[PDB]
Amino acid sequence: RVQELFEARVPRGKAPIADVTGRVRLEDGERFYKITIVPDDGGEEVVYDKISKRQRLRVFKHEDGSERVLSDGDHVEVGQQLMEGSADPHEVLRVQGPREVQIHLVREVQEVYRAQGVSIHDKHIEVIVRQMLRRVTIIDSGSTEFLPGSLIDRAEFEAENRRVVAEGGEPAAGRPVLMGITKASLATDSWLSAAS
Amino acid sequence: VNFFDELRIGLATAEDIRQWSYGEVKKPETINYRTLKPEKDGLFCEKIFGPTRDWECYCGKYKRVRFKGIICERCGVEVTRAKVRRERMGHIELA
Amino acid sequence: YRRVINRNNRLKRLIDLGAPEIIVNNEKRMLQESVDALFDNGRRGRPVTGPGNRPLKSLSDLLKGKQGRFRQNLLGKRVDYSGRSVIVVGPQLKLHQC
Amino acid sequence: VQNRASGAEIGRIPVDSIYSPVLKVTYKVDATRVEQRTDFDKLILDVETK
Amino acid sequence: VTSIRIDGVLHEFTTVPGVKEDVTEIILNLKSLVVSSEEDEPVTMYLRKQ
Amino acid sequence: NNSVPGAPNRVSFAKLREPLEVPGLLDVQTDSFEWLIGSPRWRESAAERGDVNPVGGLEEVLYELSPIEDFSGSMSLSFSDPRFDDVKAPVDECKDKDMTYAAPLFVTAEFINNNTGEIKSQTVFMGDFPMMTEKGTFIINGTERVVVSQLVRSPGVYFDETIDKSTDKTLHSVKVIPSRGAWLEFDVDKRDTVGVRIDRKRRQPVTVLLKALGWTSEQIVERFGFSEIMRSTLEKDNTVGTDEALLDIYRKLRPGEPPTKESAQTLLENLFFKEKRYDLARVGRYKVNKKLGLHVGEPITSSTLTEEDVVATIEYLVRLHEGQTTMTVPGGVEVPVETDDIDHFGNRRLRTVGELIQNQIRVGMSRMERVVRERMTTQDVEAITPQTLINIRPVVAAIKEFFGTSQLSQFMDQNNPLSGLTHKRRLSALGPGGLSRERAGLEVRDVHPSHYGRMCPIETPEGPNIGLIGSLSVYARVNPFGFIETPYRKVVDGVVSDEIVYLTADEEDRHVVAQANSPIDADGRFVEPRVLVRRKAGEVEYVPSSEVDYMDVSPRQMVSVATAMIPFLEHDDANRALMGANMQRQAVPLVRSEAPLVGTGMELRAAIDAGDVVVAEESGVIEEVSADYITVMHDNGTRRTYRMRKFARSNHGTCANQCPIVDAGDRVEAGQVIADGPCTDDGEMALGKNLLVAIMPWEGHNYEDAIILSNRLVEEDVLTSIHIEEHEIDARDTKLGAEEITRDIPNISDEVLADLDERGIVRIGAEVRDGDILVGKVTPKGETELTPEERLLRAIFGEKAREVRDTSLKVPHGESGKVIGIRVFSREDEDELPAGVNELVRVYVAQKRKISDGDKLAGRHGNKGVIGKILPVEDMPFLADGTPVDIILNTHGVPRRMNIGQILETHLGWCAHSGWKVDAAKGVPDWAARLPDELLEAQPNAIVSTPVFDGAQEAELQGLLSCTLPNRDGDVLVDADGKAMLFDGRSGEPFPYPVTVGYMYIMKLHHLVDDKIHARSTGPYSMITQQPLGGKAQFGGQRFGEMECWAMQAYGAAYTLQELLTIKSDDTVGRVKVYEAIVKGENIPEPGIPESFKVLLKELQSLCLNVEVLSS
Ligand SMILES: [Zn+2]
């Protein structure tokens, strides 16, 4: 479980997530659960076609009780998991940002470790997750030399973006993204270690 | 001595390889199968890399210890410890 | 190295003797093949195998792989002034003592 | 091994030496814990030799 | 006893014809021997039985 | 009931009688070889067993081969009737002279020429055969060898069943695994395509091949009318026609070839009816016949697959798919229909040494006959002789390489007789022809309800090879096919039957097996109406006392040989019992052994069969005895002499001796032990001594499994052992000259060589210290040489005018002791030596080791430990009568490990040692009702034995502890509970509370401390890697793992890591300079550039990659 969590692959549970906050309008399909949520401010409904073999989790209510069943027509907060399992870090990252995914990973690892009874301080995990999620994928290069879709650390990407903008060149559109330990370590600055 | 500010990998060139080496191998013969000695300019000839023994000319002319930096004209080899054999290279010439 | 040197000497002798373009070009191709093999065996095409159809360890094999010289410098070295023995608990020692 | 380092000839064989004539010793105390000032103890030591 | 000397024998890991137990067993048996010394110097005894 | 004549008397807590003695513990190992070679005894045994056809191994293998012939049919050869001859030399000389115990075999070959009509028959030599000694071992080149059996899945038919996750429908798969040939897989799928996979091909419908044979479509319809899915498949297939079917089959098998009827017709019989190409073992054919109940009434002779087998198999598959319970075929009796299991002992056979040797000689015979047939075809037909045909090199080479490099040829560990017996009885599951560690599933390593009675579930290696190495049960015997059996007595009508029979797995499953421990009346009547029973698989339930059919023999029918001698095994834990069993195989022979006070009754029997103890053959009277040899006079007037090896190095470095325990003028009966080998005392195993133990934490010196020993053991040689080293040097010829051992050696002081004799070797009986010279030799120097001229020139002139180096052999780092003997082999004396050698000399050094700190000790219940400290005899606690204890054990480790059995063992040992006398004037106490009438009165230092699963109960111990005989002083030390009052040796005052004491058996492990301790400051450096050597023997430094680098980085320590990586491992000038600075008072100079970095540079510069430094 810890190996999978750190590697940041597709969760086996792959629980549904609350992409947007709204009025949940869920129709229970005995074969495949179909979940829709009416946005409060407005917009369309995000649709989830999940497997029905599981047992629905609690609905976010004033009580906030685990015994409660997933009641249709209620309201949920953005990013909350609708059913038991694990949320893909990429989805929560894109819909919440880096802070929420960082804290969620820290809490999950701490919980799994406390399950066995062992205790370790959080900072030892913060030092790791800080390095893990320090990459900024770029969709377009525009006025930049680097190939679009190439991983660039946030510091250098920001430096190049500000340099090009200061001279009038258009900025490069990039977004943060995380990776597993293997991919985060395979891309470094020193060539000798990489060859090692 | 032990000061290495940086390390850069450069792409060599024919003249560079000419500069590095101290010989030009010419025959594929290994150590002799009878006298257990290198063959003239073979793949181990002392005239290229260095003496098989330490402080020992091929011909014995300057086999004495008190000789360093002296190349023997009779055999055309240098007199230094066997370690120098470990840090000298040869370059083959291509037609 | 034997193969490369031998083929170079064959090239030199052949060009000295004189011959049409076909043989010289074929011979140059053979030389290029040998150099490619020496800098790396099995990179492209059938790797050379002398014994038991066993691929040979090229020059580039000194760096990659488990025995690659890069990795072996990190697995550790055998040091001096060492010693190993069994351990038995002793309650007559201070904490900073052995 | 004490004789090993003496460097004698081949025909010498060392043997362990045990200089002790005593074999077993034991003691028991006969106490008298009355409130009188005669509170003492009597030692009964037994020894056997080779 | 400190050290013994067996004629016709060069060390302890061997035997001697005519006996029922090897040198180690006789050494173990001799360990039980008890003697008292009056002189403060190495004295020598003999044991000849045929 | 002591079967052996003069075993020591030790009454036992016997409650039940075993109706049969333990069978020959080595009969299993010897029977395979006896069958293989072929002897009258084996033939008589086979006839007794009832087998109709007595067939040997060599005869079978070399008869199934003949008659060979050429394709033209004008020539043929036959050769049968293999017979053996006498021995070359006795076993002792073969082991000592470096020869190999073997014997020649002669085969009478008949050479027939068809067209002429002549016969040429005469004996032919076919090399030597490594005969098996009476102790079931192979002596190769003087080194002992022992081959371990193997577990293989019997070739046959296995009906697998996999449940679909989506369809949720049963898919019945049947797979046939013959010895050699094609594999057939018939699987019913959701699509219903019942097809075949011949040699991992596409699933082609079964009907296609069925018709390919010409099987009439009407017969398909009628024989499969009961089947519905297969009828649908029949109606679904498109291609129809015998020619079309066979051509399609051939194209699927071999596409791109001329499709003709003859090709497919011949290929069918070639792949399914040509015995040579397609063959199955007789075991496989018999098992398949039993499975299908077809061809049961005749003895199997043809070992090829048949069409009726295939049609019956497909009928069985379809019937199983229909869900039927049992199926019937014309000519076959009713049999059940069910899926098979891989982990059932009714399928996993056992191939003994006979099978392996037979296969190896079969390969050799195939290689020989190929060349023989080619030679006869090509050689002249007129004056050809079989002597010129047969080539002996391939078979001899095959057997030699099998004995040498085959993984199933392991050196017989000989720490003690028990270890050797266990190794001979081992059951391997890996190696050549078996599964690997990674591919083998984890489930196979678990127990199976069919293991009861065949393979012990306790004994197993602790390492990763867990579950792959078992051991035969006590009463297990291999059937002539290779299926393990187990004795049973059949209850006919609720009455036990004294007569016994042997049942295999399949027959055992089909019957009802009772419980041995179930009470049974003396007349054979079941007192209990309900008796527990074992059923088909994992099922146990009470049943009336009438339907029960079979009953076990003894409670000890599932334990191994090693596990069978662990008292109170019914109280320990599985892991602890396994640990103790494994520990028992690591004892070290002491100098003065003593038989255990408490131990099972399977000790003397396990020692007699071990082979390490001699025994008289005929009842005679001893005339005289000696420490080196014995002479017994037979009653027929024939004098016989036995020679006993004294102080001969064992196969594992320990010593082995024999001390006769007989007196002059005693009529010794046949079968009576005459001498005791290592770990023996009066013809019974004794791996340790008896020590007085105490259970209490003592000043933390026994903290966390540590142990404390009294100096009395050290000063009395109670646990003193003898270890014999072994060294050898050789002088082999070289192109530059030949080396010769010589007393003289260049530039050496007279004192150094003061021990060497004239011939150049150390005199016997001279003490040697580490670093001393053990044997001298001179190595010539290298100069220019010419093969043809230098030889003559040296012969005539210039003799002994060249330099010589010194390469004398010296004692390694950390060895000492006496020199007991020197063996020298010379080529002049016509002594066989390895090619290219002239003088090989070996020296034996024997050292006596006294138990010291850092030594392992452990009881029989698997409780290891180390000697924490050896206090003086005057400091140990002592009983109220002045008897100091000999060892103290910690108490916190007993309840956590849950090995309470050792406490009971200690109590019983104390009770037996002190002697007891149970009161009987008023009558036998209720708790003493079941005690044997002769066990109520014991003597001091008595001997008792508690068989496993049947021993003294808790009430028995409670009663016995209350009647121990008083000490000679008149007082009793221990109380009823077993505790006693002690007296501290330091304080001198008694402890506030009593402590438990008693005698517990203690062994000695082989993990001594002298081997482990080692130091290295400066010494030889490797020449190729420039690093210090490794290993204690080479006097090399320790390894420095990368985890250590990580730790050093963690602390932030930099200069230390720099030194460890540069100044003490690689840098030559660095080492020299730092050593000189330390020798003087100068500060250590900073390290330099490690050799590793410079080598990496000078190597990477070779790939045209200009690697600069940029010092700037
Ligand atoms: Zn010279």
CB F592 within 8 A of CB F547: no
Interface contact B28, partner C, CB < 8 A: yes
Planar angle of CA A96, A98, A104, nearest 5 degrees: 80
**What is the distance in A from the centroid of ligand 1 to the CA of F781?**
21
Do C5 and B93 lie within an 8 Å CB cutoff?
no
Report residue F408 as tokens: 């199933």
Other Cβ atoms within 10 Å of F712 Cβ, number: 16
**What is the distance in A from the centroid of ligand 1 to the CA of F852?**
62
Using CA atoms, how far apart are residues F25 and F608, in angstroms rounded to an integer? 10
Q: Is A69 left (phi over 0), alpha (psi -120 to 50) or beta?
A: beta
Using CA atoms, how far apart are residues F795 and A22, in angstroms rounded to an integer? 110
Planar angle of CA F1046, F1051, F1056, nearest 5 degrees: 80
DSSP assignment of E3-49: EE--TT--SSSS--TT-SS-HHHHHHHHHT------SSS--------
What's the DSSP call for residue F319? H
Interface contact F1033, partner B, CB < 8 A: no
Report residue F650 as tokens: 């064992």
CB F694 within 8 A of CB F996: yes
Task: Measure CB to CB from residue E27 to each of D10, D15, D18 and give the nearest one.
Answer: D15
Using CA atoms, how far apart are residues B38 and B50, in angstroms rounded to an integer? 11
Using CA atoms, how far apart are residues F470 and F442, in angstroms rounded to an integer? 16
Q: Helices F27-37 and F40-49 sit at what angle, rounded to 10 degrees?
A: 110
Other Cβ atoms within 10 Å of D19 Cβ, number: 6
- CA A150, A151, A156, A157 dihedral sign is positive
> For tokens 């608990």, what's the residue?
C89
Q: Which residues contact F466 (CB under 8 A, 6 or more apart)?
A: F445, F460
C positions 37-96 inside 8 Å of A (CB):
63, 70-71, 74
**What is the distance in A from the centroid of ligand 1 to the CA of B80?**
12
Q: Which residues contact F297 (CB under 8 A, 6 or more apart)?
A: none
Tally of helices (H runs) and strands (E runs) in chain F: 27, 50
CB F660 within 8 A of CB F674: yes
Measure the N-to-C terminal CA separation of chain B; round to a whole number of Å.
40
Q: Side-chain half-sphere of F1030: how many Cα atoms within 13 Å?
A: 9
Output the CA–CA distances (angstroms, integers) from residue F967 to E26, F916, F964, F970, in the order listed: 32, 11, 9, 5
Among the listed residues B88, B12, B3, the one whose alpha carbon sits nearest the alpha carbon of residue B45 = B88
CB F25 within 8 A of CB F947: no
B45 a known binding residue? no
> What is the signed CA dihedral for F380, F383, F384, F388, rounded to 10 degrees?
-110
Using CA atoms, how far apart are residues F587 and F1008, in angstroms rounded to an integer? 11
- Burial (CB count <10 Å: 0-12, 13-18, 19+), residue F101: buried
CB E21 within 8 A of CB F627: yes
**What is the distance in A from the centroid of ligand 1 to the CA of B50?**
12
Other Cβ atoms within 10 Å of F190 Cβ, number: 10
Using CA atoms, how far apart are residues F399 and F669, in angstroms rounded to an integer? 42
Residue F1065: list chain C partners with CB under 8 A. 77-80
Residue F878: list chain D partners with CB under 8 A. 26
The b-or-e profile of C43-82 (16+ CB within 10 A means b, else e) is eeeeeeeeeeeeeeebebbbbeeeeebbeebeebbbbbeb
- Interface E:C, ≥3 CB–CB pairs < 8 Å: no
CB A11 within 8 A of CB A87: yes
Cα of D40 to nearest chain F Cα, Å: 16
Alpha helices in F80-191 (DSSP H): 91-96
**Domain with F290 in it: what CATH number?**
3.90.1110.10
Residue D14: list chain E partners with CB under 8 A. 2-3
What's the DSSP call for residue F715? H
CB D22 within 8 A of CB D49: yes
Residue C9: list chain B partners with CB under 8 A. 26
Residues forming beta bridges with residue F846, ordered by sequence position: F724, F818
Do F763 and D10 lie within an 8 Å CB cutoff?
yes
Do B35 and F1089 lie within an 8 Å CB cutoff?
no
Distance from the Cα of residue C52 to its chain's centroid: 18
Cα of C46 to nearest chain B Cα, Å: 24
F positions 850-879 inside 8 Å of C (CB):
853-854, 866-869
Task: Measure CB to CB from residue F1102 to each of C59, C79, C91 and give the nearest one.
Answer: C59
List, in sequence order, every beta strand (DSSP E) within F395-539.
426-428, 469-471, 486-490, 501-503, 530-531
CB F636 within 8 A of CB F603: no
Residue of A nearest to C71 (CA): A196
Using CA atoms, how far apart are residues D29 and F880, in angstroms rounded to an integer? 11
Residue A195: list chain C partners with CB under 8 A. 63, 70
Among the listed residues F1010, F1008, F1007, F1005, the one whose alpha carbon sits nearest the alpha carbon of residue F687 = F1005
Using CA atoms, how far apart are residues F217 and F220, in angstroms rounded to an integer? 5
Q: Between B and F, how many residue pairs show a Cβ–Cβ distance under 8 A? A: 52
Interface contact F44, partner C, CB < 8 A: no
- Expt. technique: cryo-EM
CB F522 within 8 A of CB F444: no
What's the DSSP call for residue F1061? I
DSSP assignment of B9-71: EEE--HHHHHHH-S--------S-TTT-S--TTSSS-TTTS--SSSS--SSSTT-SSS--S--
Do D13 and E31 lie within an 8 Å CB cutoff?
no
Task: Measure CB to CB from residue F882 to each of D4, D18, D24 and give the nearest one.
Answer: D24
Rg of chain A on CA atoms, in Å: 20
CB F302 within 8 A of CB F316: no
Distance from the Cα of residue B47 to its chain's centroid: 6
What's the DSSP call for residue F66? P
- Most C-contacting residue of B7, B27, B39, B40 (CB-CB within 10 A), to test interface: B27
Give the pairing of strands F326-327 and F204-205. Answer: unpaired
Do C80 and F1028 lie within an 8 Å CB cutoff?
yes
Among the listed residues F679, F761, F682, F690, the one whose alpha carbon sits nearest the alpha carbon of residue F722 = F679
DSSP collapsed to 3 states, chain A: CHHHHHHCCCCCCCCCECCCCEEEEEECCCCEEEEEEEECCCCCCEEEEEECCCCCCCCCCCCCCCCCCCCCCCEECCCCECCCCCCCHHHHHHHHCHHHHHHHHHHHHHHHHHHCCCCCCCHHHHHHHHHHCCEEEECCCCCCCCCCCCCEEHHHHHHHHHHHHHCCCCCCCEEEECCCHHHHHHCCCCHHHHHC
Q: What are phi and psi of F944, to 5 degrees?
A: -135, 155
Interface contact E5, partner D, CB < 8 A: yes
Do E11 and F659 lie within an 8 Å CB cutoff?
no
Cα of F737 to nearest chain B Cα, Å: 13
CB F11 within 8 A of CB F601: no
Using CA atoms, how far apart are residues F433 and F440, in angstroms rounded to an integer? 13
Q: Which amino acid is at F328?
A: T
CB F375 within 8 A of CB F101: no
Residue E22: list chain F partners with CB under 8 A. 627, 646-647, 657, 659
> For tokens 């499953």, what's the residue?
F509
CB A21 within 8 A of CB A78: yes
Residue of F nearest to D45 (CA): F882
Residues forming beta bridges with residue D1, ordered by sequence position: none
Output the CA–CA distances (angstroms, integers) from residue F581 to F428, F456, F565, F601, in the order listed: 18, 11, 9, 17
Alpha helices in F696-754 (DSSP H): 711-715
Q: What are phi and psi of F496, to 5 degrees?
A: -65, 145
Using CA atoms, how far apart are residues F876 and F857, in angstroms rounded to an integer? 19
Interface contact D3, partner E, CB < 8 A: yes
- Most F-contacting residue of D26, D45, D49 (CB-CB within 10 A), to test interface: D26
Output the CA–CA distances (angstroms, integers) from residue F949 to F517, F709, F1001, in the order listed: 9, 33, 20
DSSP collapsed to 3 states, F115-142: CCCEEEEEEEEEEEECCCCCCCCEEECC
D positions 10-49 inside 8 Å of E (CB):
10-18, 21
Interface contact E28, partner D, CB < 8 A: no
Q: Which amino acid is at C14?
A: L
DSSP assignment of F196-237: E-TTS---EEHHHHHHHTT--HHHHHHHTSS-SHHHHHHHH-
What's the DSSP call for residue F1059? I
CB B21 within 8 A of CB B91: yes
Q: What are phi and psi of E42, to 5 degrees?
A: -60, 115
Using CA atoms, how far apart are residues A114 and A120, in angstroms rounded to an integer? 9
Residue B17: list chain F partners with CB under 8 A. 1104
Rg of chain F on CA atoms, in Å: 37
B75 a known binding residue? yes
Q: Which residues contact F368 (CB under 8 A, 6 or more apart)?
A: F390, F391, F392, F394, F395
Give the pairing of strands F706-710 and F866-871. Answer: parallel
CB B71 within 8 A of CB B56: no
Using CA atoms, how far apart are residues F129 and F403, in angstroms rounded to an integer? 11
Residue B5: list chain F partners with CB under 8 A. 1110-1112
Using CA atoms, how far apart are residues C56 and C59, in angstroms rounded to an integer? 10
Do F628 and E20 lie within an 8 Å CB cutoff?
no
CB F766 within 8 A of CB D11: no
Residues forming beta bridges with residue F821, ordered by sequence position: F844
Using CA atoms, how far apart are residues F517 and F948, in angstroms rounded to an integer? 12
Largest CA-CA distance found in chain C, in angstroms, rounded: 93
C positions 43-62 inside 8 Å of F (CB):
59-60, 62
**What is the distance in A from the centroid of ligand 1 to the CA of F746?**
29
Output the CA–CA distances (angstroms, integers) from residue F544 to F416, F530, F713, in the order listed: 48, 5, 59
List the chains bordering chain D where 3 or more Cβ pairs fall under 8 Å. Answer: E, F
CB F732 within 8 A of CB F837: yes
List the chains bordering chain E where 3 or more Cβ pairs fall under 8 Å. Answer: D, F
Using CA atoms, how far apart are residues A20 and A44, in angstroms rounded to an integer? 10
**What is the distance in A from the centroid of ligand 1 to the CA of B72?**
4
CB F198 within 8 A of CB F228: no
Report residue F398 as tokens: 């095959």
Whether cis (ω within 30° of 0) applies to the bond prior to F67 is yes
CB F420 within 8 A of CB F412: yes
Using CA atoms, how far apart are residues F388 and F373, in angstroms rounded to an integer? 12
- Burial (CB count <10 Å: 0-12, 13-18, 19+), residue F1005: middle
* 3-state SS, residue F942: coil
Planar angle of CA F105, F110, F113, nearest 5 degrees: 150
Report residue F145 as tokens: 């060898």
Using CA atoms, how far apart are residues F452 and F623, in angstroms rounded to an integer? 50
DSSP assignment of F845-913: EEEEEE--TT-BEE-TTS---EEEEEE-TTTS-EETTS-B-SEEE-STHHHHHT-THHHHHHHHHHHHH
F positions 1061-1090 inside 8 Å of C (CB):
1061, 1064-1066
**Total length of chain E:** 50
User: By residue range, what is the domain housing residue F304?
Assistant: 153-350
Q: What DSSP element (H or E) covers F28?
A: helix F27-37
Cα of D22 to nearest chain F Cα, Å: 12
Using CA atoms, how far apart are residues F222 and F224, in angstroms rounded to an integer? 5
Using CA atoms, how far apart are residues F669 and F615, in angstroms rounded to an integer? 10
Q: Side-chain half-sphere of D40: how many Cα atoms within 13 Å?
A: 4
Residue B11: list chain F partners with CB under 8 A. 1104-1106
Using CA atoms, how far apart are residues F274 and F268, in angstroms rounded to an integer? 9
Using CA atoms, how far apart are residues F410 and F403, in angstroms rounded to an integer? 9
What's the DSSP call for residue F1064? T
* 3-state SS, residue D11: coil
Give the pairing of strands A135-138 and A174-177. Answer: antiparallel
**What is the distance in A from the centroid of ligand 1 to the CA of B63?**
8
